[PDB]
């Protein structure tokens, strides 16, 4: 319970009330491989979308709960959406975290899964952490309760405990949707406009390939890939469930820091949720010929479609087979600032 009293006196500037929680290792293992993170709070609104300041959450892992039943990581969620009096709760209201060590993996949590279980679980001197002395005397089992998670179907333990007035006001609060409805529709909107840009670039040209990346191709390429076999190019737009892991936003976050290339690569047909948001590097002493080795290793991928984004506002789609279709990236810069505030600072 070390992180509980570690960000309860630090996050009190940006947030009135702080919640203490657990994440099991089993539920967040598909967020990040090999438990590489060791956070950033950004609660987005359901009907009142906007943008909010980012709050920092101190989390430390590898340390168990008081229960021996499950052993997982520690976390905390700030609650600061409730304007003025926090007696109102916003229902169907997400809270999004950016847990990280070196930014990797994302977590989304409803306020309703949080708050329903929070009521369910119930000549100087040196300065003393009065919260630390008050935390130490509870030390019991029923402070922690297991609550199912609506995003990912697992039990997420919250630890609340009759500590002080700050949690004391918390369980007395009650009040009388569309928060994940927007982010899917937004990403599919920009994916539809990108596929329309590729449609008009294939239309103003002949229906042909320019083949930016060289790779050798067999004679049976029109057989083993059928005539107008755009099955992957059909279903590409359904396969992009994520955006903030995608390389599509990696160009927009890298405009201010200069310009490299980013790759969203997907399986020809359901071979696995492959890869999102990687780098093609010209900075290190691998150099431009080292980046060209990566790009020909990209074009030689015979079982994956590829999408390329540049940081300067251009988008490409590399077919398996070295073929490519040029395209444009440009969008209304309100959504640029929207994504830039969704990730971090403007």
């Amino acid at each position: 319970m070390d992180v509980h009293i570690d960000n309860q006196v630090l996050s009190g500037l940006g947030t009135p009330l702080l919640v203490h929680l657990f994440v099991p290792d089993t539920v967040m293992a598909e967020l990040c491989p090999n438990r590489v993170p060791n956070a950033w709070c950004q609660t987005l609104f359901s009907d009142r979308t906007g943008l909010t300041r980012v709050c920092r959450v101190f989390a430390a892992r590898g340390m168990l709960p008081g229960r021996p039943s499950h052993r997982g990581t520690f976390t905390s969620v700030p609650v600061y959406c409730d304007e003025g009096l926090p007696e109102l709760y916003n229902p169907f209201h997400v809270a999004a975290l950016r847990f990280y060590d070196e930014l990797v993996g994302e977590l989304q949590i409803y306020y309703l899964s949080l708050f329903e279980g929070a009521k369910r679980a119930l000549l100087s001197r040196v300065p003393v952490s009065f919260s630390k002395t008050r935390r130490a005397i509870r030390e019991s089992r029923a402070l922690v309760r297991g609550i199912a998670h609506i995003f990912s179907p697992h039990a997420l333990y919250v630890v609340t405990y009759p500590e002080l007035s700050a949690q004391g006001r918390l369980h007395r609060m009650t009040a009388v949707l569309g928060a994940p409805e927007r982010e899917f529709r937004f990403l599919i909107s920009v994916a539809l406009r990108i596929s329309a840009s590729f449609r008009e670039k294939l239309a103003m040209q002949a229906w042909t390939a320019q083949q930016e990346i060289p790779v050798v191709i067999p004679t049976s390429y029109s057989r083993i890939y059928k005539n107008s076999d755009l099955i992957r190019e059909a279903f590409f737009t359904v396969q992009t469930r994520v955006s903030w892991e995608s390389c599509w936003v990696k160009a927009t976050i890298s405009n201010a820091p200069d310009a490299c290339l980013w790759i969203d690569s997907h399986p020809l047909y359901e071979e696995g949720a492959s890869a999102w948001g990687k780098v093609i590097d010209s900075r290190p002493p691998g150099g431009l010929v080292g980046a060209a080795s990566q790009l020909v290793a990209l074009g030689t991928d015979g079982h994956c479609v590829h999408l390329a984004t540049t940081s300067d506002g251009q988008a490409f789609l590399v077919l398996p087979g070295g073929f490519v279709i040029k395209g444009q990236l440009a969008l209304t810069p309100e959504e640029r600032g929207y994504i830039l505030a969704r990730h971090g600072i403007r």
Binding site: V54, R98, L103, L123, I253, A256, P257, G344
Partner: protein, 297 residues
């Protein structure tokens, strides 16, 4: 009192290296205690690890130093630094530092690039990098700048909106000098012992933050309320929340004595943590032959 300490090699120092070794005569070299490896700084600063400037600073501060005086083939001689003796040192270092005021000279690892103070030894499988010699205040601001970068690279990387990583690389930037600005080498990861040094420094910082003298808060609040001093220019006529909220209480004579007493002992401990590496007090530096006569301070 012996000084003439030879270091026996095991292979032929070829004439491509004899020229640049005779070019580096009168410089300073750290000792191990000889064997061909461990006599220099390449034993702790290799190409395989990050240049951390703390573990090599630990090797400079733990073991003693030596002047290079003669380089023969197949063997070279070294002259130690025992105290009470006046050693004459020439400024044979590629980032030049003019010793006008002739302050206390100070050893440093080559934080201004490995390439200027290295020597390529192809006789034996060893490379020797020379320590950097420069006066004390430039050395201390190099220490504070390299620890500030070693603590701030991680926290600029830790932000999700890292629109400015290059802000610190020019803000820290060069070293602060009037006649010329000299850029240095900046490592991304501070490494183990650099983080141990920042850990001990954080220990000391959070212990002394438990006792703040409240009396100077009233004086800086008054100087804000009075004319803006040029030393106050970092505040630009602003009272932050912390200094506004540590001054709700009164000012007495009781707390101040014990506060300033433990501040005396903890600032003497911090000077002992900043008396770091062997230093050389300098008297009668003759500029016309570029020799700074020094005894081991």
């Amino acid at each position: 009192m012996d000084l003439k300490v030879v270091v026996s090699l095991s292979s032929r120092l070829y004439t491509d290296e004899i020229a640049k070794m005779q070019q580096r005569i009168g410089c300073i070299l750290p000792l191990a205690s000889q064997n061909v490896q461990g006599l220099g700084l390449g034993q702790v600063y290799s190409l395989e690890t990050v240049p951390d400037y703390v573990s090599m600073y630990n090797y400079l501060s733990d073991c003693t130093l030596a002047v290079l005086d003669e380089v023969s083939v197949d063997s070279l001689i070294l002259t130690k630094i025992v105290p009470g003796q006046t050693y004459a040192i020439k400024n044979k270092y590629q980032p030049f530092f003019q010793w006008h005021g002739t302050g206390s000279l100070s050893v440093m690892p080559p934080v201004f690039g490995r390439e200027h103070a290295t020597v390529k030894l192809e006789s034996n499988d060893v490379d020797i990098v020379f320590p950097m010699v420069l006066p004390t205040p430039i050395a201390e601001e190099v220490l504070q700048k390299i620890l500030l970068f070693n603590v701030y690279s991680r926290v600029v990387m830790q932000a999700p909106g890292n629109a400015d990583m290059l802000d610190v690389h020019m803000h820290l930037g060069s070293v602060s000098y009037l006649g010329h600005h000299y850029e240095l080498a900046l490592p991304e990861v501070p490494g183990p012992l650099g983080l141990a040094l920042l850990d001990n420094l954080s220990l000391y910082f959070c212990i002394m933050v438990t006792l703040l003298p409240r009396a100077s808060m009233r004086l800086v609040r008054g100087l804000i309320r009075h004319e803006h001093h040029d030393l106050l220019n970092l505040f630009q006529e602003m009272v932050p929340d912390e200094i506004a909220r540590i001054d709700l209480d009164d000012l007495s004579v009781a707390d101040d004595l014990s506060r300033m007493r433990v501040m005396m002992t903890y600032l003497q401990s911090l000077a002992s943590l900043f008396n770091l590496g062997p230093r050389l007090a300098t008297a009668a530096y003759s500029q016309e032959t570029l020799t700074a006569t020094c005894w081991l301070r």
